[PDB]
Write a protein that binds this ligand. Structure first.
Ligand SMILES: [Ca+2]
Ligand SMILES: [Ca+2]
Ligand SMILES: [Zn+2]
Ligand SMILES: [Zn+2]
Length: 349
């Protein structure tokens, strides 16, 4: 089909990429969304926020088996497990996680057996992480109700991230799903030894700004944490994601909820992008004139951070149009993909 004159590349080939921040959920939902990830990505960091959370290495082991049981037979995918940090997580769990071979990070969520009320409670365990090389993956927002929602990431940098890296200068840290110029600049310019600081960037925070939440009506399927920010912030994230700087790498934060949990009086946070993540990223990188940067960001830098080999497999994105389904089903339960119903411009071959 002849391109218009203004219409860079018809395909893009790259080493098989990985998803360094993923929610696979459990049971029927897991069965439905895992194949979407496994088509696109060789490995993913599987987040631990089940109900109840995955706080122990044995829990992670059992969750890993459930994921492998749901992996359709032709597909190759390795789940890289995580623990949910809590006030009561002991150093002993850190050591058994490191030794298990299948736990690749410990996640810190804002708020004692189910989460962290004060990070000062976790000192000995952070020490063990530093000793063992277990990275801390951080959802970097304060919860302080006197702080405007849009400021909570910037405030976390000053209140928590800076003291953390000062107090544990050998601890490997990933600033998850950064959304602001503040965070991008923080990571980009930080004095850090190689491999000590990384950050993940979602497809949705590259493509949208907060106006998307309110176009023509309130749009719960576009609602996630951290929330979409001002356009100025989105521009900064695109600049970071297309920079070639080895500290930034791909994490979808694909976070599915049933449609009926999104379209209610108190809609759950999370965008579902595992069906079409690579295609969304391809759109963003294409718009930026930087498709030649997608490989580094998607395929190399997160593997490098986590000490895992770069893939010997090649995959190919084709600039062909396709109409996204409005709904994908978890048994009888529908999940709306971000942009479901719309026609996007790339398809993974
Ligand atoms: Ca404002
Ligand atoms: Ca703006
Ligand atoms: Zn998060
Ligand atoms: Zn997440």
């Amino acid at each position: 089909p002849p391109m218009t004159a203004s219409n860079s590349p018809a395909t893009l080939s790259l080493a098989r990429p990985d998803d360094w921040h993923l929610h696979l959920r459990d049971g029927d939902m897991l069965a439905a969304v895992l194949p979407h990830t496994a088509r696109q990505f060789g490995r993913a960091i599987v987040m631990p926020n089940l109900k109840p959370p995955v706080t122990t290495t044995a829990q992670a082991q059992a969750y890993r088996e459930r994921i492998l049981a749901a992996l359709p037979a032709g597909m190759t995918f390795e789940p890289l497990m995580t623990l949910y940090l809590t006030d009561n997580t002991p150093p002993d769990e850190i050591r058994r996680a490191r030794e298990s071979g299948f736990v690749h990070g410990v996640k810190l969520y804002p708020a004692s057996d189910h989460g962290v009320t004060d990070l000062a409670k976790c000192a000995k365990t952070l020490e063990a992480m530093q000793e063992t090389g277990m990275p801390l993956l951080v959802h970097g927002e304060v919860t302080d109700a006197s702080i405007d929602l849009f400021d909570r990431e910037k405030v976390f940098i000053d209140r928590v991230m800076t003291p953390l890296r000062r107090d544990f200068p050998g601890l490997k840290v990933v600033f998850e799903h950064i959304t602001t110029k503040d965070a991008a600049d923080y990571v980009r310019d930080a004095d850090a030894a190689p491999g000590l600081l990384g950050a993940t960037i979602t497809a949705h925070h590259l493509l949208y700004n907060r106006n998307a939440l309110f176009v023509g009506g309130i749009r719960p399927h576009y609602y996630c944490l951290p929330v979409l920010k001002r356009e100025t912030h989105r521009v900064a994230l695109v600049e970071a994601a297309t920079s070639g700087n080895p500290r930034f790498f791909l994490g979808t934060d694909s976070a599915p909820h049933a449609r009926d949990a999104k379209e209610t009086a108190c809609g759950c946070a999370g965008c579902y992008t595992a069906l079409h993540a690579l295609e969304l990223y391809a759109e963003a990188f294409d718009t930026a004139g930087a498709l030649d940067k997608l490989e580094g960001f998607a395929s190399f830098f997160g593997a490098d951070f986590y000490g895992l080999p770069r893939s010997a497999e090649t995959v190919t994105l084709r600039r062909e149009p396709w109409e996204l389904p409005r709904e994908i089903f978890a048994g009888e339960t529908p999940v709306v993909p971000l942009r479901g119903g719309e026609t996007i411009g790339w398809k993974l071959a």
